[model samples]
Target: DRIITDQLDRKVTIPDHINRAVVLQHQTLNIAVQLDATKQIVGVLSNWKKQLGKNYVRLAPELENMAMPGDLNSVNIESLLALKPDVVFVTNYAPSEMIKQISDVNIPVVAISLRTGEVGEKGKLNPTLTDEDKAYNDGLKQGIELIAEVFEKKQQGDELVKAAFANRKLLADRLGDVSADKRVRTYMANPDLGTYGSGKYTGLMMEHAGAYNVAAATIKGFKQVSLENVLEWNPAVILVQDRYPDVVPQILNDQGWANIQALKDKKVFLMPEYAKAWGYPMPEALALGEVWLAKALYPQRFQDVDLDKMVNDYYQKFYRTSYKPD
Candidate 1:
């Protein structure tokens, strides 16, 4: 038996070995598969196919039959009642009522934080990059460690964290002494006028990859900015990361955007879709994304980096096999 304190600081006990689990959050499922705990997953929240993509599902085909308890945010307790799971990974952002209800049924609910603290060191709106980076690492590793303790896979869990760090360090090494001021002026363009600022993952990703986010200083989170404002910012590189069609082309062909440096140089790039877009916020995914984005920012420095092979190598380590498109 083991006592575990999850992200919510709730104390829970579990059997010495967990034979079954229901990861209600996608990031938790990502961690589980990495920890070799996929065998124990009996259920997951809805949209496993959409959120995780087939690349991930192929690693744990059991997800195809895993009971979906309905919806992403609010789940049905009844749907979970019949699953007889030994444990439940409640999303960190889940409602409090849901947590108590699961606990009421004598089930162990482990709250795994899938979000990084968006605040600063003094709890201000603006925080140091050091604090922001720590929050990201803490939230991810905390969840991974909790799962490891519950399933008695501390070694595997440690290794997962290690690989995640190894990937991060590799990116840092490649970036080599590029300070924030030296970074290229970049803007992340999403479908339907969507954009985000330094308070979000995309901004964090841009910083990690040795680039400046055009929205970092002004926007708070996800918001729509005017084309006029985007023109004023006049980013040198434009990153598009979603399913929007003709977005890049539309931007390229716009007469108003014709003077933009990114448009002139053809620096617009798309986030690759593998298990998920490399830009997705899971720690492992972000580590991979940082390197990919870095290579994009400095192609000559990354001239020898084979992105396709790197993507496959990452999948190979996690899935224990190379990537194969369906």
Candidate 2:
């Protein structure tokens, strides 16, 4: 049998096919599912299941039977070696010592770098109109390409890219018809208890949704802001991530929050948690975000949009399960 190894820097003889594999990252597990290679996955890291939930795990039963590799920052080298996997997929976030130890066992290790830009660093927004938009779109495109390479699913990746472009066109067409002066000022409260600063994915989604993000001027990444800033911004709408729905009312009744327009207008909305991370700009995220944005921006114009159906379709396709509203 012939075998190809990239990390080892040399080819070695092996079985006719790779039967057992281990995924050391959640994103890698997502890639495996996308490629229809879930059956080959024999072991997986644990925390991802809690983050993604049972609906995702049901679609990839192979993961349930596997051993836990370790936590996000570290893994047990002996436990991983015991699995006897044909190959192990590691990520850029994995500890360097872990990678070296895995290699010492003579097992092939494939390192996939998905943590784009500077690790532990926030993204920055360029105020130059051309540069700002270019940086945003480029990041989205590159993200799609990187995931595609991991699964060797280039065709699926291309299709997703095409869909994203089409969605952008749809958003532009819809916004073009609206009066430029009527654009709503919005703010997204991210799951991390911080605001979405300029050049973040949430900012990009806000732009596509036809709302001017109030936090766009902040240094990129999430940061806690004082009530004074919220009162001063006076955003027309506030979209809070549903991961912590309780935070909405707390922010609303806080001492000075009543001065914000969104609170007075009762314009606070919660985005479904499942859809929040997966569907943002990807084919799934774009479809979900577009419908939600259209309805939020012009409620009267989009009364006919059935958001529940959109959510169901996306969850079915990617998660392979039905969505349960909480």
Candidate 3:
């Protein structure tokens, strides 16, 4: 008998002891993992493995065998019912009818928007980078607290939330006033020639890491951009997420990109697995991705910093394990 308000303004009364949960939103699922409530996760999204990559399986091996009841937009009522989850998690974008369907069956549903009023719509930019940044950080805190409350893992939730804020403060204190001209003009490569603009979480992380997302003005969410766009932007740095091992080589070997500054300077970098989270807000994004990007962009300023330690520490603190890059 626990009452909680979700991002969608739905008052959900959850079980006092949530022994089982069905998580449709990958981001919400991430909180469950961080809060050490993966044991309660009886079901997850169909794309969890592809979205989270191998590190997820390494952290929560049980999830590899967990029942997949649904995805970002839809669910199988029969599959969900079989799991007998005490609670269910879904993205705010999930259809209201879908939420009702789950609720009508006596299961409490928590819809995670992962964005505040300051940040509107998933695929669009906010008024200012400052606002966007603050909104995203706030959203992360809200999501963490909500899930933590549900899992009764307030202490672990606090640690993760505080770590994200601390990282934000540290980055701002160090690099907030950096001149726009001095910031590294960067581009993020998504799967299938897609890219993230300033509106997306990845863009926020890149900006915090001292990158000026070259695609912010052109692309909004995740979308395919023409090769002409890349050449036109001429980004000084290109970041390819680690999940796509083949993308780096493809970018490196492509003649179409030869004229871009990122190619000319050989500044394209492969982002670590923890740096990118398409579905959920992983602690590593704040604790590791931001610092790693900052260090990568401003090597001179971060000369004394040890990102390896951050990786290991984050792995142990949140995931309760050491980082095994291999």
Best by TM-score: 3
Q: How many backbone clashes does candidate 2 have?
A: 2
lDDT per residue for candidate 3 within 195-247, as digits (tens), equals 87655677778778877778888776667899989889989888887766678
Error of 1 at 229 (Å): 4.8
TM-scores of the candidates are: 0.81, 0.70, 0.92
Q: Give the worst 10-residue stretch by lDDT in candidate 2.
A: 119-128
Model 1, range 90-202, lDDT digits (tens) per residue? 76657777777888888888877634454223222233344556676676677677778887789988877766665676667877688767888888886666677754556
Question: On TM-score, who's better, 1 or 2?
Answer: 1
Question: Local distance difference test, per candidate?
Answer: 0.70, 0.60, 0.78
The candidate 1 region of ten consecutive residues with least summed lDDT is 119-128
Question: How many residue pairs clash per model?
Answer: 0, 2, 1
Deviation from native of the Cα of residue 197 in model 2, angstroms:
1.0
- Model 2 spans > 4 angstroms off: 1-37, 42-46, 49-66, 71-73, 85-149, 152-166, 177-181, 252-256, 277-281, 303-310
| Candidate 2 TM-score over all chains jointly | 0.70
List of clashing residue pairs for candidate 2: 279-285, 280-285
Sort by lDDT, best first: what order? 3, 1, 2
RMSD of every candidate to native, in Å, equals 4.0, 5.5, 2.5
